[PDB]
Amino acid sequence: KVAKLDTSQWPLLLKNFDKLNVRTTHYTPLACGSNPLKREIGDYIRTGFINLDKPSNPSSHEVVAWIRRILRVEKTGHSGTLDPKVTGCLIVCIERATRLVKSQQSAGKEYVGIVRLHNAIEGGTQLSRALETLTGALFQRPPLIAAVKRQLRVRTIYESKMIEYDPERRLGIFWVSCEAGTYIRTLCVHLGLLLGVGGQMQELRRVRSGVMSEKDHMVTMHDVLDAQWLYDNHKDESYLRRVVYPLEKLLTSHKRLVMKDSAVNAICYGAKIMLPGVLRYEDGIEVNQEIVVITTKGEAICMAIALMTTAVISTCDHGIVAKIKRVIMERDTYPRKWGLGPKASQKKLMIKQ
Amino acid sequence: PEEDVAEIQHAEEFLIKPESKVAKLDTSQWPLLLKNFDKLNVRTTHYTPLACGSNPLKREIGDYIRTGFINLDKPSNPSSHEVVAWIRRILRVEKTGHSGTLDPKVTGCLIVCIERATRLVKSQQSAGKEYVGIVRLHNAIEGGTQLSRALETLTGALFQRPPLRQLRVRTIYESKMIEYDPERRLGIFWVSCEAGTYIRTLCVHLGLLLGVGGQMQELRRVRSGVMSEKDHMVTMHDVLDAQWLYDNHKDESYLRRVVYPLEKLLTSHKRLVMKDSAVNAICYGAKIMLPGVLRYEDGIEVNQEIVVITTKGEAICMAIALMTTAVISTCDHGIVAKIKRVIMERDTYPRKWGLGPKASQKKLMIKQGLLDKHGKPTDSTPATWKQEYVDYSE
Amino acid sequence: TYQELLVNQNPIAQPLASRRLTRKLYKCIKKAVKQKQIRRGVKEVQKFVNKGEKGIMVLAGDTLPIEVYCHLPVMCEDRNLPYVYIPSKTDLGAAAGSKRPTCVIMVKPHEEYQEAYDECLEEVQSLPLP
Amino acid sequence: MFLQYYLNEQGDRVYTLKKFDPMGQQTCSAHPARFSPDDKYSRHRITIKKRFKVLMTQQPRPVL
Amino acid sequence: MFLQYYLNEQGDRVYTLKKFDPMGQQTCSAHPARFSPDDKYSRHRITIKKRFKVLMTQQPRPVL
Amino acid sequence: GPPERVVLLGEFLHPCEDDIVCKCTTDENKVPYFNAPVYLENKEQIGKVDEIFGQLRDFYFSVKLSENMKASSFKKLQKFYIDPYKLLPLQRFLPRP
Amino acid sequence: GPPERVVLLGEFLHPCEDDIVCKCTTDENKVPYFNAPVYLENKEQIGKVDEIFGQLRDFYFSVKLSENMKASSFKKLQKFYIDPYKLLPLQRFLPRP
RNA sequence: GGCCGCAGGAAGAGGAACGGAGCGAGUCCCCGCGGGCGCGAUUCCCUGAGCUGUGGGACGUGCACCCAGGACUCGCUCACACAUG
């Protein structure tokens, strides 16, 4: 029935693959990989992440500690700290997905918080104007830590919105879209100074962490514990495969570069991505741009830096398309198939002869 | 069904299957000078790209502004020199120029070139321009047919004199009557003309030719060469606001709608794609020789103005074609074009001349004393080299 | 005619005054014109609002281009001044005692006509955000 | 705590302080249930979430 | 300033001396707004152009 | 002690919980040091810079007042002055080229 | 880092045992801080003020040179510059009224 | 357009493994993290006007948290790969 599906309904990094530019259509397939969704449950978890809804008591490092007890894994990372009393979207990368943590930690966040004002204001419009004032690149003092005075720094707030105001309790809901490392507690203090009445952040929840949000694919800590239990006691993967998602779901925004099966293992060993191995390449690849390199089965091989643009790839016949930034896939997932090609064979032949 | 699609995604295997059909690209939607890159004639595919420059649209904001221009809608108080001085001050940039002087009270298309795009100002100043003005007649006329007949008469190569110098010739290609108002004796006219045509003078001549007398009430430029008033046109407020938004919100989005790269001005010209090794040579003032041509457009003719571009789509230089398309396809060596105006900076691309096979051969023979220090033949030169090597200095 | 003027309207012309509020505002302007309390045009209104005056700023919803006066709404919100858009430019100039259209006028309060001014001010302060 | 929400017609969370939405239904707490790592009631939650067809495995599968 | 215009079905300016279209609505002035370099209302213009979704960034992207 | 000279730091806006919020108006958009002494034009110390907030080119600051001072004393658009050595250039906070 | 500006400190006289003795020529006869960085007019640090000696209104100073500098490099009557904040007024050292 | 002066060149366009990866350590960056979890007995106390029963506290007691990344630098391992029509 896959034949009936339009390419727009293919999963993850194979979505809309027919609208990539085709360099060559010919290669020799190898029975090595799987589609990222059909990885054996062990491998699926080791290359996966959880879009967690963090609870309101523990610290974010305690939460990811609890996840690595439950799933019985050695490594986890967490897409930016939420403070102990803050809830919401916390991307927890597991094992080999921890290679992506910098891209997740540096992504744009969104928050929904409550500011409590210490005296009455004229109305909801006055709070709405103070939020418009604190849009754009703002000064914010990073809090003191271990008696180390960090200097004043700049963080951008992309959008702000005043959702509701209650004049009785002097409470105001705000929604903020902002750069990573923005202090929302500090924003509420400044919002209080700007109004003149004073203020504090009553409450906070993170509604987005870059690509993932609370809208879809989000799960609670009970689901994580519950899914593992069902696998341990009844040998059922079904629940775990809805809690954990493969790391390819975090990379769907990046520009793609599809490689032949021969090239895959070479790149995993630390070879540069050469042009003879490129099957397909996306529109809008620029120089020094971070791209995802994938297999024909949609598995992420590596995060690579492009040294050719889309147009340059179209004109050339050989050479370095991209250099590695970080290898995702393990060595020897695919077999060694390098040195077999025409020019590489000619080189080795003419050295011997 | 949404759920049926979701079920197939997890059940059945996906694979980009092998095929035997020829790989056909679609470059019709690629930006600027990379549009229809597929349709260029290919001389060779074999070269080493350098990864130094950028696609013109995706330059860093500093480099983007320095290699860019604004299709400005000029406001009605200041002079054209004052307007570009404001833009120079706003963008915090060293040099600025424009595509033709509009008088203080005239509005419309003013292509303000920024920094390294100011190398195109002579080409933009010489380009054909369209105006929409209002002639105010001193006395009444029978009807709008008479004023149209006067514009019909002044279509062609005309005598003109500047406002308050020598007599000058200026062609008006097309002219038209939009409408006429008998009450206030005002008539809107549209004229397409060459650069430096005086529209004040045209309004006086319309007045004399009719017999009633007249002058120019007001004027607006609707076209300046390639750019028009419906093509990406922007106001002084937008320019100020876009810079401010970049300063205060760190948002480049608005600047990139205001400013466009200079390559957008050159989209009409025929393209000659050079190899990355040849790029910096041409920037230093070399001849555009055949060994470095990757691709070349259809319908290049001799003495035609062509744009010479990199593989990334950057403009290197405007150039005069010495060879036809048919000659480039068949010849073994020679000079393909000569430089008219170098656009690209020196050392944008690295300095990679004299590394070739035939160039290295010539350097070796100069070291061996087989050629002279200035690369000229001797009596001792082999007849193979002396016959084959067509020195272009001649 | 009021409903016909909605066809001519400007993208930023909200909150628009109702048919009845438009009528009340014209008569408050005419009374203020007789006492010479109004300020007309962008140049004057911008100067006086910056200088420190307060009142009601009536904007014209037929104004194009918007760049002539689109800075004024935020100038009001900085100083908590009430503002409102009326449908026409030509009607604002006629009410202001001008034979040309006008894009903006600021009506200041006065003891002569506080009843009409208060009816307009409170209704304009009550206007919902778009 | 203070943050509540109700879903709009396209399934997006609409945050609010008020205990009732504009259609008179009760608003949910924005925050998830408090978690313990020493929770031993995994069997119990699966048992009745299966019974009432509200276990995560029984819902429509997400489109990826 | 006498020069006015109304937009055609094609999208281009039709210049005219009259203050109304053939289809009834008002013609816009052909000339752009007066500018002065001392202007310090960039924040103000952007602020409301964002609100009504008429800022140049929020429009459909041009064809290059 | 009292500095040799003082440069314009900013102007008084509304008070806020017994310290004073002030719009910053420095030449070259310079930014004050944290806990930098704030003076009136008579070179008398009124307080110290506590908070710095707002957009980069249009920022505010609160002043934690001295022992003897009260927030009710100051009038609207009253100017405050700072020792020019505990200012920093805006370029420091702007991103690296 | 490098200061925003530098003011005339003094001029080069003879070297003395691998540091340089300099006649002080400050405006208002201001006195430098001990271990205050000494710059050339290019805002490159040559050393630090080690000794200050001589009469109040006609005083000298030695400069302990930087790692890379040599005392032979400097010419006669070559000027040196200091960050104006690590100067002090002469009135401080003059007696109390 | 032309003339003069200064500066950079005096250019035939090269290179189908260049010079990589994965770990480990030291040092920076990141970095608001005594708090979090459980059980026991006088229903262990408590609908406090004090947060709070979808949880707050007292006393016993135990338990698990305080990373993971990136950059630079000096090791170990695996390669030194132009991708088989």
Author numbering:
A (entry chain G): 43 to 395
B (entry chain C): 23 to 186, 192 to 421
C (entry chain E): 23 to 152
D (entry chain J), E (entry chain F): 1 to 64
F (entry chain H), G (entry chain h): 65 to 161
Paper quotes:
Telomerase is a ribonucleoprotein (RNP), which preserves telomere length by adding telomeric repeats (GGTTAG in humans) to the chromosome 3’ termini. The enzymatic activity of telomerase relies on a telomerase reverse transcriptase (TERT) and an internal RNA template contained in the telomerase RNA (TER or hTR in humans). The human telomerase holoenzyme contains 11 accessory subunits, including histone H2A-H2B dimer, two sets of the H/ACA heterotetramers (dyskerin, NOP10, NHP2 and GAR1) and telomerase Cajal body localization factor, TCAB1 (8, 9). Recent cryo-electron microscopy (cryo-EM) structures revealed the segregation of human telomerase subunits into two lobes flexibly connected by hTR.
However, our cryo-EM structure reveals that dimerization is primarily facilitated by interactions between the two H/ACA RNPs, with the two catalytic cores positioned away from the dimerization interface. In our dimer structure, the two H/ACA RNPs pack against each other through an intricate network of protein-RNA and protein-protein interactions, which rigidifies the RNA linkers in hTR. This limits the relative conformations between the lobes of each protomer. The P4/5 linker of hTR from one protomer binds to a cleft formed by the 5’ dyskerin, 5’ NOP10, and 5’ NHP2 of the other protomer. The P4.2 stem is anchored by residues Lys121 and Arg122 of the 5’ NHP2 and further stabilized by other residues in the 5’ NHP2 (Arg62, Lys65, and Lys69) and NOP10 (Arg34). The junction between the P4.2 and P5 stems (nucleotides 327–330) also engages in backbone interactions with the 5’ dyskerin, specifically with residues Arg158, Arg211, and Arg212. A cluster of previously unaccounted disease mutations in hTR, NOP10, NHP2 and dyskerin is located at the dimerization interface between the 5’ H/ACA proteins and the P4/5 linker of hTR. In particular, NOP10 R34 and dyskerin R158 directly interact with the P4/5 linker. In our dimer structure, we observe clear density corresponding to the two N-terminal RG domains of the two 3’ GAR1, one from each protomer. In our structure, the intertwined N-terminal RG domains of the two 3’ GAR1 make contacts with the P7b stems of the two hTR.
